[PDB]
Amino acid sequence: AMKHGIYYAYWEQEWEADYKYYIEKVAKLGFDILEIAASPLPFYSDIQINELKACAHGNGITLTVGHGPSAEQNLSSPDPDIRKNAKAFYTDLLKRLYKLDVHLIGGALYSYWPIDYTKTIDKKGDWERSVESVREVAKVAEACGVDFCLEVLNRFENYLINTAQEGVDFVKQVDHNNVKVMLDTFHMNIEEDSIGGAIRTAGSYLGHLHTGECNRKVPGRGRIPWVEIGEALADIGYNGSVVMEPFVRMGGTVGSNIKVWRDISNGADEKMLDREAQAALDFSRYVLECH
Amino acid sequence: MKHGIYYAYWEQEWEADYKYYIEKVAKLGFDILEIAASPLPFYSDIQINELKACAHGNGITLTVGHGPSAEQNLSSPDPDIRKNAKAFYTDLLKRLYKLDVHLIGGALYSYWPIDYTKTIDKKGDWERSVESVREVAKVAEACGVDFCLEVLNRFENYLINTAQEGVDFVKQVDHNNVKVMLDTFHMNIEEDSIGGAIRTAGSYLGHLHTGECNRKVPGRGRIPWVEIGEALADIGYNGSVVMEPFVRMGGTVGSNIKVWRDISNGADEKMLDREAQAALDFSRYVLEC
């Protein structure tokens, strides 16, 4: 019923990589999707884009995209020039997604990430500016055939949208068909009173789901209430994609942004990493589907 | 075991009239009032004694919590900061002794909240902290105080994130007045198993903070209280249990804890009093035996 994927970053420490290599890999592991980071895409020549797309197609894999925007790409910024640069970044990015045959982008698209908490916070303001900026970027995504998914994050990674109710509120205000709410088991695990409740609250608006255990290991052997999640996705008729985003390695920008300060992977080599991702894929298909 | 509640549940700054809160929590039924250490250094020996008297008078025991500033960072590579940090704790510990306060907990091995803007040297900071803490432990052992190292989630600290890392750090310190401190809010993020984490701390568990996943008072959230209660019994925990709910926006507290929505849902002091009391009955009931 649902399509299952994994973020390429599970194997890499930077926000870019040889996506073709991961497409070939997740396809043999049996995944339906490979989620990739948007950051290197604006530096892809036309033929590079075509090759990536031809790779996904040839391997029967669908590409989705995640993005943690930089401060210069902050659609909610009070500075009108940053907003302008941001809109131009997204417009160019969305057109590149069109050339890639990609139809979903997700992450803290209504803000930037990681948040510099060193600075003063104007939530009400940022919220207002964000809703307006997202409104117009949404027109471009729609024209590009891309769903713009706004991911609800925990309090330490953002201050605008921390619960599914805030995400639904923000999205209703945006009021554009191709703009959705996106939940993540790791972020819900912290902020939500109820996991099934948060999903039922998102309901018809839910456009993407990220998965990971409480401490971001692969889905299945931790404390996340997977069965409850499966019932709730069934209650809301969720048709979509489910992308596991495990982060178990220290090091690099990835290690530092996700804040992995111990070797959660326990010395796993690449092959070990593959086997767990595959077991977690099988587990996700078995537990999360068909009610 | 004894149950308490951190005073900040009612305030938006890391200070307040602790005497007012002692009488409040005593009315509510608590055995403990946990107070922020921050204003304690600016106390006169007169203020210390009355607070101590106010507590004893109401039958309330006092515990202290502390989010060290950058300049109180015992892990700092800067020797002047380490110096000033030990000086701060030595005085504080002495003052705590003049209040018959026998327990202090928090990111005592580091600083909070930490600035992730700068570069982090985990292995270095860890070695410096072990040493500094063992030293402060001496002053602690003298003032009759258990120096409790709270295990925090990755967003708030990078040295100790799991009970296992906590036990290892404390064992490296190798001193009787240094303990591991667990918090249900942080365990909920970092641990594979809640009961397993508590069993791991075992004899080193010197203090426990409670709160729901999103920091509401214990009870109607997703925290596995029964499992916790059972594990505390597995390790024969005798220590205290202090709820540390944070449900209000605003101020340094709302900012440090990162409450960006009104979780209390417009609760007034009376409403907050009731929920705390309900959470108290709930905790004594579920967590014991």
Add this chain to the structure above:
Amino acid sequence: MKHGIYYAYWEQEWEADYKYYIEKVAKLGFDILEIAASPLPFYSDIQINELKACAHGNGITLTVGHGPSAEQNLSSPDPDIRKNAKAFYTDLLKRLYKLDVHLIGGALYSYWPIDYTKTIDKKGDWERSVESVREVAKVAEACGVDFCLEVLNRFENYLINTAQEGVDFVKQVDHNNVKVMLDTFHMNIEEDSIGGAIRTAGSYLGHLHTGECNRKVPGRGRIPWVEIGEALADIGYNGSVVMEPFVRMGGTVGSNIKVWRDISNGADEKMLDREAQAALDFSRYVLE
């Protein structure tokens, strides 16, 4: 939401001085005392009034539970037994009206405990029950009583084991005074989902029994109380919630409930009172 407790939590027989428990329960803070129906047929109109006055006085609502005997089996193939069964409930409902009791619950569509040696004809008994209950239901309407059919685990009943079955049975009866009743001890065994079972019962839910997996008072076991509070809220449940803990060996109750070890761990009456009161505070707090 009104909270009660079943008097047998203290007693080892399906009968006791309900006046004594009405008072004990009133000081513990419950809103309801649930009693067994079996002694009621032996009460004079005077005793009935003495009971209804002791309750109205202590500000306690009374609910009734009943585990039918074989002779009271509304689903029996034996047309005589069905006739006797219908008269029994007809008389009982009339008595309940006098006591101003508006709810009766239990395996009212069958009997309890079930004798499993007797061969089982589920399809047969199911059709007979539906017919029999629809009749009794008119009587129930007249007396102003909600006839609640408790869904039980497979070891205590074979007709209705899950909320879905209960709902099908009730819909087939098709009569407003017939409700589905759930019990956490029973759901714990048979259901795929607790919150889901509740949501399935939805509008048909007329009564809820509570207890831990092993029948201890609500709160320190594995039943998912928060999930229940949430689902009751989702279906807009305002009915009552009655705990029915059984922690003592011995007697017809100990034998019928199958308590084969001292689950109360030597609790004396004041100890049992204390735990029921704590469980009551827990239930008001968590479930609402």
Add this chain to the structure above:
Amino acid sequence: MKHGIYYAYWEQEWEADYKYYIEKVAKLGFDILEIAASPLPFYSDIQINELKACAHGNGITLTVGHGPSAEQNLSSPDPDIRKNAKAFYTDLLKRLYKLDVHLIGGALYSYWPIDYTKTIDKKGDWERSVESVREVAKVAEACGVDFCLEVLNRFENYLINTAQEGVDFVKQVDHNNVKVMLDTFHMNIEEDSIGGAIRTAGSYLGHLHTGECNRKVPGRGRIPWVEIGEALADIGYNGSVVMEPFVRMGGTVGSNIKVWRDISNGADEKMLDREAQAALDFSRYVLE
């Protein structure tokens, strides 16, 4: 850690063509096939060597389960029944030695299913059973067989309902080849804590049965599999894990297990295989 499944998952009677299930199970990927012991006493020496050969040929290990009949009740007050009982198990154990199986489990210290009409004499039945099992243990040791006592829920047994009661019994038996056996379906009913029950069994746990709350295959139900995996690692479990799902109505199995609704949802043999295999993968992954 070795995983198996009970052949009765596909059948409605306490016997069947075990060679057929050995091949099916090898193909699905299981390490073990657990079979009912009842047909085994009537196996010629030839049939025994054929079954053993099939098992070795397919890389499958065999374990055995058994619901004793009243005449095989080692706890019986009637000394003749105890005599028959002992002789039944001594012959059975030697056959297991021939078939090359090192494990037998079930309510071996009693009989199953239990006739509850008979008044219960727990204490008496308990002492006798301890004594009888101890004698049998010697034969079990001689045959290199682990005699595992399954802890059951109150509706199916009155002697051992919790892990603590099972350990007490086994410690009282005081013999190395007698072990405690837990079952997720039974634990779900009686225990305060699943993980706690497993850690209480600890070194004494010699076998584990799995099933969801309502006996569906492991995985999409409410059993806390992760907590079980963690407790098994806590104690360092070196035994096997056999799922024992019962999702079909009919026959002695359907009535003994009390399946009164089609839990399988019309699953044909093929769908049952797929689900069994999917649960095997889940079990290997989660229980670690």
